[PDB]
Chain length 385, copies 4
């Protein structure tokens, strides 16, 4: 189960680089040089890396210092063959963003948030990124009167419309992906799920430039079914990127390595991504637990990739099993893919077999055979077939 | 705090009519005649009632029996002045719907679900309803292989498109509202939140005919902020109807009377509905607990209305308080309503006060004053002002 | 992975016998004769069955009817070799129990609850049960003023003390197990977790007669770690019985077949039960989904047993792997089992290596190696070793 | 609603002193001198303050530096009349505690945790504290194999037994209180609820020295009813201390000011504490949101006290209302306080009115009148009576 760069596995600098500070504890690991992270991830078989502006260039850097941080980074990419497919903006760490970036109540903060973002879009294009992610982690409230949500959505639309006007006028080939999260670090965060983000995009001036970047753990922080939400994003044609990790239920954002947390949900996610032909990066947004030293960091990163490849094998074996194919027919998944009324409305109204002469008790008695199908799926996952 | 029919309070027949059967227990109350419910609700000050087809006309009724059930019901409305502003379809109780109505795997069940719905749309128009609600309580799954969600969303779109073609061709003045719920009675339900429903509507052939009917308790079953979701529905212009009740956190659907459960969330909800000028029905989808006899049923229904009117008074007093108006300015809610960059993109890029000469430390030091504002809101809610 | 009666797998009559009624739907399956359930479970390889009084003898039965229901049941046990290791009382379905049994506000209901329980204890002993389970599903409240919880705990202690006096005076060899659940069907249920039940038992007059009967899904309805709670019950010497099923997070009680829901939690549960030498019944309290016909009922029951046996194999292979044994030493699980200060308090206070000369930075730098250990556990679960 | 020191309101140094660092953001406020916090809290009407060792004496301090930090602190207490009723140990911030203090896998860390605790017990007694709190925030795991929970509970019992031997041998008048929390910062924390802590205490060598210190938000992080858990702690005689704050459901630990979050739960909590005659400190463990400057810190602290005093007034008015007293009788709260069978077991078995001649249908028809009682409680809370 060895990864190659053809598997398109990517990692954020901030993931293996997390020093282990949490709300109740200081750092347990020293800071990593981005150049060292690129080299070590390349040896594990990764395809590329991602960054926030402030991961790569320390906040407050002069233009000369900025030049040389980028230069060192580019040499490591050239020296390893690593790519940069996605970048994003840090609009959450600095105290100026304590009430938000794009939807801060103070207007001068909102303008500064836009200028900080635009500067990093230029850098992202220079490094070859095709997707630009926005996670509005500070957009929200802890109390009800602090934020008029209709005015805040006006300001959020204004910001994303201006970013779309900028990339159009510059002739850039980059698209935007909005990353939803329901809460943490704000009491409630605006656009809290995949659904809310998809609905918001349809109100932007150029909806074709915007999609979603869902995260496993974030939808599970609201108790939702992550493969179901991904399926709705694919159905809408909006799955531009994806963040993979693990989460144990409704609690703080754990960011466990992928495959930990809800294992069966990870199986059904890989089944869906591979069956639908998703061709974007398989990005890991995770934190090696602060119990670990650096050997444990690289073991945890390797585990992300290994677990994806094991689940891919088991999902492919499940769908290729003739006995599974007949079970799917037994449960009428073939009929679910057929139109309800391709004959049209008038024919449906005139069809007495659809109502007047429909035998409801005979139809109700038909078992769905879902439990036998699910145990076949369980046997394949566990390698008991 | 006495309600009048001008307050537009409405109740479902199935609410005060719930006999008290739950998953572990038999009924504790006898069945109510719909005519008796109309009379008793009118004396409490309600504006109108709502129904599923199967609440009004017992399943399997002949056409003659159907005539006389409707006739009796219409006489009670004439005898009381009660209105019928909303109706909906029961596509969840009968065993034939055990895998769904519009997205059942069996195609013949899907056609029957459509015909059962269309028959009740005709009746709803006859009785004067302006909104037709769809709650797809059986659309979903308990296991991952049972339901291909992309095919299911194709079938859900096909059904709603056909219903829109029917109402257009008949010349009906009625609109549709989709009611989301995250789970129960299925393990996961399709379109689980307000956001997912709003995004789905934008893919229908005639999006102007469809809005949402959110329920307090349903969004709280996913831990979400209900006033925030309502604000996004209002921002999109899609709040066609609303279901009011109470819920104590993430657990089974409690359907407590409105004002029970999360009291502060109810306060901020009433503040939002009244400030935005929502003019639709204030509908209660609740269940009097099965501990109660019939005197307790009517006390619980009266409590729904009383709590709305108390919160309306306290929310209006909060917004009219000069000291609250100055606190809102102190927290810069006025600046949140102002455009970020009405000067346009080029001016923003050329504005050195937005980046090169922006003092981030001076801006970060400004307190938001949110806690004083929230304690003023708490004092108003409790009548300590 | 074929079960034999030596595996001690047991099932409640109410599990495979569930007709499929849920809060929003009527039954989808006909009622099963208890005699037929005993025969079919014996052919699947079960060890025995369990019952509530009202599963076996319909409520309101005459003494003659009661005789003949028991006689038929005993003949099926003799004809199959099936055992009855546990029984319990139905104090939740009948409307008289709408505010509780042992803690109902009405005193005459509490006395009736005790007499109904005592009558079934006699029958349980006659049939050879060694454990008597109490699930107080109606003991609780939906609102704060309805139930003074200190008075309710007085009444709960009084009831269990009287049941202990009865079994002592009769000379019965049976023990009691309290089954906790946090909510549903009451808004909150008294003694909501394993911990609350264990603490309550220590206040009874004869604590040695009482233990717990925890259920997988019930502790997960509060977001808790089920193997952790079982470990505390074993540590206290109070795990008298256990209920196995599956649950997908914090929501209504799903009662999925064992192994569904949180698969990794099921793995760590089987590891713990087998390592600690638990020798009681492996009881399944589950509901075949109402989508299924009777063939699906027996497939779901068979799946319960199969999944336990697969996880048992993988857990045993994990603990027997020499590379896992060295990883456990690398993470210092051996040191966790060693006393902190067998040298005593005075020696600890005099030990300068424990404080004055302890190198905290050298100790803090030691990685725990937990992630490599957990990936070895994941590889064993999936059969990638 | 002005507090006086007779109201026994207390605050931790770490509460108003929180600088605003969260997992995604740097500090927004400068550090407070403990002397300044004592002075400002005294002017607001507080009774006293609490501390962790590391709040008062920076980690790594020399014995001379330690002397002078304590001396300055004692002068501020003398200069204000403020008391110190509780103290506790920081066993969670330093990296050495990344796998726990008392249950760390490394034995040398466990010994150091005990010595760090004992040193602060001496200081607490010197300052007059009557309660010593233990919050084992790092005791737990993120993965299943990292922690054998039975060995960990052995080590936890060993630590608390040694602390009890120390205070006994020194002749100290101080008692211990264990503070439970279900998760955060570990994936699962040992002793996760009030119930688990109460059960654990009964296994210690000297159970009379140990009680619980429950926190509002912590029990709500598991979806539990906080007044119910407090009632069980009072029933067991173990409520030695209490932590008051607010929490909005199941998510990260918010530590909102008291009265925010679940307002009705706060009302029923104050009703219970005042009715049972709880005479310990009313301690606030809260964090002023990082949106606030120092004026907002003191406004948030003042709000904690104000909300307690408003709820106390409304709860007292509720219990003193003659119409509420008759509603309580209507719902048979008087009968719940009466013994079920003071006549004893034999009389109960011989009482035909308890079973053979009990009219179950007449009893089942009696309404409980809980909804009218709860609306009277709602009217009193809102000041609509
Ligand atoms: Mg995350
Ligand atoms: Mg992410
Ligand atoms: Mg509901
Ligand atoms: Mg509803
Ligand atoms: Mg259950
Ligand atoms: Mg059970
Ligand atoms: Mg807390
Ligand atoms: Mg605390």
């Amino acid at each position: 189960y060895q990864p190659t760069p053809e598997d398109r596995f990517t990692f954020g600098l901030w993931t293996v680089g997390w020093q282990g500070r949490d709300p109740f504890g200081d750092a347990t690991r020293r800071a990593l040089d981005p150049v060292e992270s690129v080299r070590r991830l390349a040896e594990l078989g990764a395809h590329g890396v991602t960054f926030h502006d402030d991961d790569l260039i320390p906040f407050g850097s002069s233009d000369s210092e900025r030049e040389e941080h980028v230069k060192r980074f580019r040499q490591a990419l050239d020296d390893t063959g690593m790519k940069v497919p996605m970048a994003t903006t840090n609009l959450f760490t600095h105290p100026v963003f304590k009430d938000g970036g794009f939807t801060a109540n103070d207007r001068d903060v909102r303008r500064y948030a836009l200028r900080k973002t635009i500067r990093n879009i230029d850098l992202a294009v220079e490094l070859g990124a095709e997707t630009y992610v926005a996670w509005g982690g500070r957009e929200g409230a802890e109390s009800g009167g602090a934020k008029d949500v209709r005015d805040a959505l006006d300001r959020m639309k204004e910001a994303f419309d201006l970013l779309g006007e900028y990339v159009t006028s510059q002739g850039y080939d980059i698209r935007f992906a909005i990353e939803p999260k329901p809460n943490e670090p704000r009491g409630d965060i605006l656009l809290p799920t995949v659904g809310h983000a998809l609905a918001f995009i349809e109100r932007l001036e150029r909806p074709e430039l915007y999609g979603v970047n869902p995260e496993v753990g974030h939808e599970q922080m609201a108790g939702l079914n992550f493969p179901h939400g991904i399926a709705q994003a694919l159905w809408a044609g909006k799955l531009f990127h994806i963040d993979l990790n693990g989460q144990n239920g409704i609690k703080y954002d754990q960011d466990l390595r992928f495959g930990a947390g809800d294992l069966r949900a990870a199986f059904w996610l890989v089944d869906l991504l591979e069956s639908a032909g998703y061709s974007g990066p398989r990005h890991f947004d995770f934190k090696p637990p602060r119990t670990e030293d650096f050997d444990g960091v690289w073991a945890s990163a390797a585990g992300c990739m290994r677990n994806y490849l094991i689940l891919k094998e088991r999902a492919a074996a499940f769908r290729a099993d003739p006995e599974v194919q007949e079970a799917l027919r037994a449960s009428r998944l073939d009929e679910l893919a057929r139109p309800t009324a391709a004959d049209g409305l008038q024919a449906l109204l005139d069809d007495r077999s659809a109502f007047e002469e429909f035998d409801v008790d005979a139809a109700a008695a038909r078992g769905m055979a879902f439990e036998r199908l699910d145990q076949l799926a369980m046997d394949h996952l566990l390698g008991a077939r």
